[PDB]
Amino acid sequence: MFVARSIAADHKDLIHDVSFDFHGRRMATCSSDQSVKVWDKSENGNWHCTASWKTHSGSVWRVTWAHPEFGQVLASCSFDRTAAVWEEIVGESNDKLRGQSHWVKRTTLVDSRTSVTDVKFAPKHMGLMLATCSADGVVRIYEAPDVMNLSQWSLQHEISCKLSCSCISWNPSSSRAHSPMIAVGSDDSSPNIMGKVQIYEYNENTRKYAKAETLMSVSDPVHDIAFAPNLGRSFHILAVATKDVRIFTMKPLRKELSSSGGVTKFEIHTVAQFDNHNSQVWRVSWNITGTVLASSGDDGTVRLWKANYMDNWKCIGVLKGDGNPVGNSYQGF
Amino acid sequence: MEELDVDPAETPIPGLGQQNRHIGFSWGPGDLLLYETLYQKQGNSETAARCPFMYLVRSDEDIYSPVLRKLFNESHSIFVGLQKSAEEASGKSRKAQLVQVSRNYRSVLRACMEEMHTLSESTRETAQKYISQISILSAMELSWNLCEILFIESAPAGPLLILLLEWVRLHVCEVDNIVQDVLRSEKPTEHEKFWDGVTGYVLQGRMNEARQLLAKEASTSASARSMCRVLDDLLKKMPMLHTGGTQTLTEFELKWQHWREECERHLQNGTFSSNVHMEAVCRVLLGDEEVLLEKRDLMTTWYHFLVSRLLFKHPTVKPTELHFYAQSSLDMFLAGDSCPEPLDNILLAAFEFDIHQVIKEFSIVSSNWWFVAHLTDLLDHCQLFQAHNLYFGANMREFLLLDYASGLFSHHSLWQLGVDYFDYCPNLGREYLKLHMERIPLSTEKKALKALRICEQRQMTEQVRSICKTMAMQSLCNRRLGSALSWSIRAKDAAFATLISDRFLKEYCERGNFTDLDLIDNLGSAMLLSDRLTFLGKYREFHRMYSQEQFSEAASLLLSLMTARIAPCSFWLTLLLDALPLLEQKQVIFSAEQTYELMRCLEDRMAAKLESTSPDEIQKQDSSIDNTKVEMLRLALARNLARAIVTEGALQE
Amino acid sequence: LQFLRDTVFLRYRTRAYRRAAEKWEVAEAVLDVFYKLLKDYEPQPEDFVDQYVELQGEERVAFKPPGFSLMHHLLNESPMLELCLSLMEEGVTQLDTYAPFPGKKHLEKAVAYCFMLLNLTLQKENRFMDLLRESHLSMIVTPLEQLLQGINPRSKKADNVVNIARYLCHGNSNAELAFESAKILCSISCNSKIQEKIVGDFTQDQNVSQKLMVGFVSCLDSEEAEELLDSEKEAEDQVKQTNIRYMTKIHILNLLITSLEMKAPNLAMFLLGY
Amino acid sequence: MADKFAAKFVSHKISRTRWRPVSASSLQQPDVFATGSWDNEENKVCVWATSDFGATSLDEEYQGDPKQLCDIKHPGDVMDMQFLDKERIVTGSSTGTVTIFRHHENNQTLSVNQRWEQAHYHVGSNMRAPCTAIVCSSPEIVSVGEDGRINCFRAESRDVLRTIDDADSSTMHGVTFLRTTEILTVNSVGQLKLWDLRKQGNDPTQIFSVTGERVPLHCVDRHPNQQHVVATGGQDGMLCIWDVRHGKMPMSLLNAHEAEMWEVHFHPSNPDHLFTCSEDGSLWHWDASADSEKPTFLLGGRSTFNISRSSIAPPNANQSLACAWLSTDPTKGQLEITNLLPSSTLSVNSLDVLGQNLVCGTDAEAIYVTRRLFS
């Protein structure tokens, strides 16, 4: 129950994202003001402008934090053809003394000459990589070898993803018998083109990503793409955001015996499809347990969808930023 | 919940109803993190005013009410007692303990009730939500009694009527209020609530004190004295198990019918034809439903309506016809004034057994999966049940377990019970535990370590080692190499162990000396993993075999270490620099040929060093000094080896 | 004061000893001191008057007489009571060890200080209560007979009197020890309502009463008969101990007369065998 | 048997033992540990090292050894000494002085950093007083004392940051965290008192005593299976267990003894076993349940008179069993405390348990340790 103000932070420009600590208490706002503002939820909760330093050129669309086992490290993207990397390093030995802090650009990936449409770190189980995508249809894949050796970045891999890259997604993987995959939603406009979302796997014997799939069905510029958190989930689900809402279930029906890789046999169902937002749906945000999805669009509303004991899906929340949402709701059959 | 897809439970934002703007989001742990963001804006124009307010939408608003902690914790306590018992006991005993725990839980909720009062009579503003929660918790008491009595013992009629009358007297508190008012104002027979209390007594089956007031009435009126005496005889004959438990129901029904027929006899005699109250009592005693429907207003309790129906007409019961009686009672009560109501239909579905739809009614009325979770544990213990079970079409247990633990994580210590209940859904629970752990801020040695304990008794070393290395490297992030060290000894990681060993060796490059040496010297056979630390410790060993001049075993250790062929060359420099005076000393164990694979490797390493880098990149008077000193050192090596060979030969004589 | 009581009198028992004899002489060195304290401290009515004294209108703490305090501590539960108890049980135990030991001597001396100290405790507690009754100061005291029937928290039973009696059997050459035991017994007997408990104590067991009668026979068969009281070879010791058990039977008979001054039960019928 | 002890005749009296911390969370025994003197040669703080665990340590006497490292001497006894962080040390002085070191493990020295020379004191006599309990959650520091003041400090200051004084204060026995910034004590009146770090005033923040034989409660601690439920021990011999963060209520009133509980402390590897130390002349290991039908740590130890290790288990077919916890009515029975005396021991004034490992220093002029608390 917090009433909403239109009052905003001192950012004189559009605020792009806010990123929160993967261990808590810490947040940061990225905007078109070009200054990155690190706020820290105090013990009283009062978050104040604890840091603010310039990081890029152009509209800094996205800031992504990494777990401190990555180091207290962050990636950021903007209209600079490149991707900046900052870890916050402090002086002195933290026993009961707190010295002076300082923002560190470990690197900035020039990413050829292409604007970084999305960028984020790599998952735990696959080593420590990071992925960048651009409107070039090209995805660069950079590498840091050792734990103290952070600043250095070498393009370990690149995946050419046909149409211009817009929104990317890592597949959660925690089994040696499982593989890492990537889903790619394209915001290029072509009603002709089906499968505007492209899916790649790491075939380990080939040591390489192949195209796993496309969504031969999709001809709508994808706003964002979001795997459902699936690690105990014995298959996968995908949330796809455009003018509508696409939800797909991908179950391994045949895993091959001597021909695995390239493509593996999955059933895909359009287990949900909704226009309930009645407008273009920008983003879908998962709960970390992989059980909840939030959805927002131009109307400044968020609809909140879950699975039941038939795993089917309902909106369990409808939240208005253009108005005042109603109270509780429950139902059965 | 159990039903996991419902009509969107929207959370009101009173803001942006007049002052709108587009919304941005990030997920909280059990809360929801909303703020204003500038894209596809609902409102108008930019804003830059340094606004520090937050939007914390809480499906966990329950955490902010003070009593819920006691609620759920002591529920936890009794509950864990229940399960740690569930592996034991049998049949009759099991049933007994079921009833016991039932009474225990009700008493706990009762305690909540009285303290809840203590809060409410104090409060003048929050009293209203206290009223709401007292209402709901009373509903759970009444429903809980109903379910237990209906099911747990599965007793036959007789004791059933006894326990239901006990139920009604427990849950009805008006009669004692009328008692207090009657004793408060004038004489009981002069009290306006005299006959009101008398009717309450007739309803409650407390004919002893009912006859006590009948004595007051008969003393007051010389015309109704015989009327009171006849009624007293009726109350003497009325059923209190006309025949005992070793008898047959036939005899009890005989006595019931004798009492019945004499009551109709006295009625039709016109014996009760001059006292309105007592003749209405005669209709009641004959179970005449017109008086019951008239008193419906003083009743307010159509379950009391039905229990009166059953007692005054149906001393024997049948479960199938219980639904029939409930239907009749409900229709007759709605006849006075029909209005919408959940609880009536809920307790219906109770009598027609459908526990699951009863739960559904509860879950649409409310949002507390707690009470249902304990319902579930009971049903789990009940050794098989079926009312269209949704555990064969769903998993109510783990559903409520995870809802419950998720609510528990909301507080920085109250997650702990969530741990204790992932103790019974671990195939996702322990992993969600690590998941929420890494996500939440943490420092605490003991709670973290205990989570570790929990894990290893379950033999789950993988997440274990992950977290150990993670928090160790945070330790060193705070510049604490010591905690990193011990914790790598905890993770058993030769890699990072060798790394920080090499940090130690660079410290020796800086200072030329050892610190906290015994802290590693004590490590024993565990040294076999980190080879860099193994080398550093063996250097300590040789260093002190020098310091007490232990020539033989010093040289033997050094030989073994170099045959092991480990560590960078720039340090084997100082290694043999210190080996010098031993080589000087007259010793026969000197194996010159082994010394010379030492020196040929030295040549190899110095060649490699020169190829990889220049020995001196600094131009100073002392750089050439250091160089020519190195050549002199190897020249000394040659000459001393020559002397050692001479001595060895002169001793081979 | 606090030093000696805590650091020593609480801690003397807590020590390690290569030879057992040390404990005896340590305990004597502490008991005798407490005895001079008791013996010297003579109470007064003004001992109850004021604790804060207005040094220039400033009520300052001025701690009560050390006597005052030590009594009142004894007058309520004191570890002194407990260690006195202990002393008594090890006294009985060593006496049960009729094989001679280097330190039995220090034992009779120590327990003797026990007897006589407690005697003075009795002779002063009366007057102490007396002064207390008029006092407006709120002090708490429990009369000691209640202690004598208190549940001993090692045996969970009120064998205070039984432990007292155990030394009558041992006084086969200890007319003194019998004397102090019995005189304390009658000094307690100076009041009423105990014969019942005494009878229960006697009636625990047949063998208990058998060892009891063995002890009483030991006490009584020599009231002028030791075959040495007329011998000048042993000289003054025999005649002095004759004096001693003379006074013992004196106070025995005093106690018996007092017991019969009360209604049934009266332990004299018991003791006569009835 | 239960993993017999290593006894090292240190020829020294012990008062305070406290693990050298590395914070965060790990399982090892801190090999390094700082020791406050009962009376070793003077009152001092020494640095000592223990060859952790039966692994890589079964030597240097029999089953390991702690070793003296250095020491620095201290006015006023070390009644209590807790560590702010990895190497910042805070001890109370009987001189009423709060003393903070930074240790130098490599230099084997202690640095005399910060002193609050001023502490709890007696009025009407102008005399100094030691501190009853120090509270260290880095870096906030709390001090509580006999006279009843409250001493609230941020780390690193030689002047009082705050001392809450009251028109109502008393003697304080034992303190524990209820939450991160919530605190409880047991008192010498039979008094259970509560405070929040942020909100205080005049007279105690919260005061409790109820039926159940209120006795001066000496020791309190928060359970090794949960903190907001805590246990207290006092004169009567009955252990009182409570659930709070703003309101008290009894889990149990266990008739676990007949006499004062001087100090109680909690088993890590067993969140449901306990230990008690008492200068009544004894020291007990406390165990769940009672009876010798389970391994007896009620009469275990004492050199002779040993009993333990009995067991029987129903298969749950036609067999039923019930125990005390399954009753919620108060006033439960004894719960298995065993006093142990190897050949002779004096007042054990400091003890520590980590996992099933135990160390303890004493007035018996030696140290006693075990790898395992059971068998």
Residue numbers in the entry:
A (entry chain C): 1 to 333
B (entry chain A): 1 to 653
C (entry chain S): 733 to 1006
D (entry chain B): 1 to 375
What is written in the article reporting this PDB entry?
Three scaffold rings, including an inner ring (IR), a cytoplasmic ring (CR) and a nuclear ring (NR), anchored onto the nuclear envelope (NE), provide bases for other functional parts, such as the cytoplasmic filament, nuclear basket, and permeability barrier. Here, we determined the 8 Å resolution cryo-electron microscopic (cryo-EM) structure of the outer rings containing nuclear ring (NR) and cytoplasmic ring (CR) from the Xenopus laevis NPC, with local resolutions reaching 4.9 Å.
However, in this study, according to the high-resolution and isotropic cryo-EM map of the X. laevis NR, we found only one copy of the ELYS density situated on the convex side of the inner Nup160 in each NR asymmetric unit. The AlphaFold2 predicted model of the ELYS NTD is fitted well into our cryo-EM map of NR. It is obvious that ELYS has extensive and tight interactions in both the β-propeller domain and α-solenoid domain with the inner Nup160 (β-propeller domain and α7-α34), suggesting that during the ELYS-mediated NPC assembly process, Nup160 could be easily recruited by ELYS. The 9th to 12th α-helices (S555-G675) of ELYS come close to the 8th α-helix (D557-N578) of the inner Nup133 in the adjacent NR subunit, stabilizing the head-to-tail connection of the NR subunits. In the MID, the tower helix of Nup205 (α55-α57, E1195-T1293), together with the finger helix of Nup107 (α34, Q770-F814) in the adjacent NR subunit, is inserted into the grooves formed by Nup85 (α23-α25, D493-E549) and Nup160 (α40, G1255-S1282). In the CTD, the 63rd and 64th α-helices and 75th to 84th α-helices of Nup205 form tight contacts with the 1st to 4th α-helices and 7th and 8th α-helices of inner Nup107 in the adjacent NR subunit, respectively. These results suggest that Nup205 plays an important role in stabilizing the head-to-tail connection of asymmetric units of the NR.
